Design a protein around this ligand. Structure first.
Ligand code: HEM
Ligand code: HEM
Lengths: 441, 441
């Protein structure tokens, strides 16, 4: 009945607990201390952080809870607009864009993106093939180069050419700085405001120019030529721009974090790495992986799912109660009460996964049938789940599969896991050496 | 390219090689002579027996190979119907029953079965506690009493009361006779009448029990109230009867073999027995083991896995190629070509386990990541893997843990391993003496 609550800060209540550079991990330690649910209060804000599958399976009842825009999503909405990720379910543009964009994100649609994914993946492999001896790989940086370029290429046929850059493309600097200012608003400036508005324009300018500039096998074509079957309407240019920005943000950093965490866990678990490398070598028999071959990388996907279990890179999503309801038979929620799903804690629910929740064992996912309902939510829930899941998983499987095929990896620094937190999670400073296996492309 | 083949018998080809009372062991010796794969020909039948992890890891690719009904499963289907074990993957009732029954077989579901498992396990312990001096235990017999009663109780809330019997319950007598006739058809009018009499005896009780069935914590409840999420449809009563029969076959005989082989290997490896006994004594601190305590019986679980390695009691499963495919880069298979996975041979692949493949070393399973992919398939593969695996392992871990806690065991006859072969494997005539440790329940 009585809901736990972490330490308060007088008038600021719990909000200064988010005044930290690792708020998800701070929220996880609070959840470790307080359990499956704890009230988090701030001035003018009350939310509840769910950490058990028991409560989250109820939160994932779409008849009772709908996606809420967390404060982070509302700040991302300042430039992602009514794009898919930052729109309310009841906004016309969500379901409209959902229906228009769902076919271009199916498992059937990955066949058309695969060649462009391979394009960037080959650039990643070639970059590492071209490293000198004792030179190392900055993993999250290269993973971000790879995923951002992949979504740029697969999304609207735009080459950010991140592997040709030290400082990212001006759009990327603005997007990250806009995302940074959005996150700093959580923890919370006239200069930051002007910069944010400048970064919004930089982002808008490039996308709207690309929408104006633009048939290819990319999301942009589907958004210009796609009609929502329901309303019969195509997305207007403004929403198309919000979707591209949405896809640029949503589709690069969570996927790079997953790859970066996957490789981190691979180099920390040589048995898993060997097992995944053996599959990559066995399955990727061609110089260029095919779509079908990426599907055969079962264990690689198992590695990716276990990396998503330990560190879901989009580490939370928000829900609101559509009507007065009771959560778990002891937490009454009024209409509009907000819930936060602490995904990394959910994925450490010992009552679901056993006591070895902190162990990286992809064998947990050997049979996806053994996973209870709503125990594993790295891609959100229901109709508001990640539309790019298949895209992210296909890209990450392909790229990790190519990485494992072409290189032996060394944790040469014995890297101490340091999870930098933006709105996503990444192992900061994670560096490896890759000894090429000298397998041509 | 050319596939080895064991000796032929003219028009009967290889089939008379199965006219033997230990055909798996005959197939293993053939595999020892011919290697990782050999063609097995019969009138109107060609199959290939795989024995290496190298080929079986490919056979376990579900995109290329699906479960085939072996001739044994086709004969078991004559009374197990389209139950889970004897249905094709493409049969609507498989995935339907698979989806409905999967939650009632999860590791999360074992918490609710645990009390009934303890119920039968205590009955086993009490039987041995009540043995007089110099009286011995007929191990597979008592293990079958335990596993049959456990699946009867956990599955349908029906007490076979096998520990109150010398001659098994009439359903079990008919089932064993039915499985025998099913196996005897492999080696090949009164049989048929007898085979039909055993089917009717099995159907009548189950359909009665299904008709008689109150809400219980059993599989029958879940099957009566469970809806397939996919089709929204519940299992019809006919399939429920097939599932109960399936669980009555599948749910005990392989598990009793595992317990019997586990204890056989423990009394043949006193250090392993001591180590497992010490863990049982350390972990099982209560008179009644808890679910959590059974999970802490790591070495006992490792003991069971190594017993399943040496003698997987479901010793084979059949696969067919869904499309034209190449096995191991040198054995072209056409669409519908059949594969048999000779599991005990797989589990003796020296390239996986080392030269000591024949040794009972439970330590091989301390880390499941250090085991190559598809090297260990005692519970089948993929979506057609054993749905009762966690059930079998939890029951066997609990029961073996209680056995190790409550008794010192003596291989008083220096029992010579004699493996009776039905459709499962059991150490026939395996007898032990148990000196009670006088630890109350
Ligand atoms: C490992 C990689 C990824 C992870 C962990 C991830 C995670 C998530 C999560 C948890 C949500 C739910 C957000 C919420 O409920 O507030 C979401 C939504 C979304 N994601 Fe992803 N995502 C990944 C990759 C991608 C990619 C590659 C794309 C695009 C190419 C993408 C586009 C989207 C969109 C558009 C939504 C909103 C869907 C809707 O509300 O209709 N994501 N993602
Ligand atoms: C040590 C004990 C056990 C072993 C070694 C074992 C082994 C296996 C194997 C190898 C398969 C695959 C069959 C094939 O592919 O043709 C299988 C399937 C199956 N087993 Fe088990 N089993 C055990 C215990 C159990 C228990 C306790 C249950 C039920 C309570 C059970 C029920 C089933 C079912 C229903 C299937 C078919 C699943 C499907 O195809 O959807 N088994 N088992």
């Amino acid at each position: 009945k009585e809901m736990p609550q972490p330490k308060t800060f007088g008038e600021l209540k719990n909000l200064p607990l988010l005044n930290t550079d690792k708020p998800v991990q701070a929220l996880m330690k609070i959840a470790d201390e307080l359990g499956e649910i704890f009230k988090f209060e701030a001035p003018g804000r009350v939310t509840r952080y769910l950490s058990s599958q028991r409560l989250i399976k109820e939160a994932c009842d779409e008849s009772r809870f709908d996606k809420n825009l967390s404060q982070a999503l509302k700040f991302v909405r300042d430039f992602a607009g009514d794009g898919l990720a930052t729109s309310w379910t009841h906004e016309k543009n969500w379901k409209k864009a959902h229906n228009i964009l769902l076919p271009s994100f199916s498992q059937q649609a990955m066949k058309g993106y695969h060649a462009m994914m391979v394009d960037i993946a080959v650039q990643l492999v070639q970059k590492w093939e071209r490293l000198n001896a004792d030179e190392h790989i900055e993993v999250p940086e290269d993973m971000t180069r790879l995923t951002l370029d992949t979504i740029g290429l697969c999304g609207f046929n735009y080459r950010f050419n991140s592997f040709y850059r030290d400082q990212p493309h001006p759009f990327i600097t603005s997007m990250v700085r806009a995302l940074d200012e959005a996150m700093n608003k959580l923890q919370r400036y006239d200069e930051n405001k002007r910069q944010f508005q400048e970064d919004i324009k930089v982002m808008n300018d490039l996308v709207d120019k690309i929408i104006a500039d633009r048939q290819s096998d990319d999301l942009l074509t589907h958004m210009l030529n796609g009609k929502d079957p329901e309303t019969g309407e195509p997305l207007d240019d403004e929403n198309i721009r919000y979707q591209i920005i949405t896809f640029l943000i949503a589709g690069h950093e969570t996927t790079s974090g997953l790859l970066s965490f996957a490789l981190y866990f691979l180099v920390k678990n040589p048995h898993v790495l060997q097992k995944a490398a053996e599959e990559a070598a066995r399955v990727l028999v061609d110089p260029v992986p095919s779509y079908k071959q990426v599907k055969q990388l079962k264990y690689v996907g198992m590695v990716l799912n276990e990396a998503l279990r330990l560190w879901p890179t989009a580490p939370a999503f928000s829900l609101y109660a559509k009507e007065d309801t009771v959560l778990g038979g002891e937490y009454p929620l009024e209409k509009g009460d907000e819930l936060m799903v602490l995904i990394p804690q959910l994925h450490r629910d010992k009552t679901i996964w056993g006591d070895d929740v902190e162990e990286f064992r992809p064998e947990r996912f050997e049979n996806p049938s053994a996973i209870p309902q709503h125990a594993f939510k790295p891609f959100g829930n229901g109709q508001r789940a990640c539309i790019g899941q298949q895209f992210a998983l296909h890209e990450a499987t392909l790229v990790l599969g190519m990485m494992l095929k072409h290189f032996d990896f060394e944790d040469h620094t014995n890297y101490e896991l340091d999870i930098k937190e933006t709105l996503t999670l990444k192992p900061e400073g994670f560096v490896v050496k890759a000894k090429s296996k000298k397998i041509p492309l």
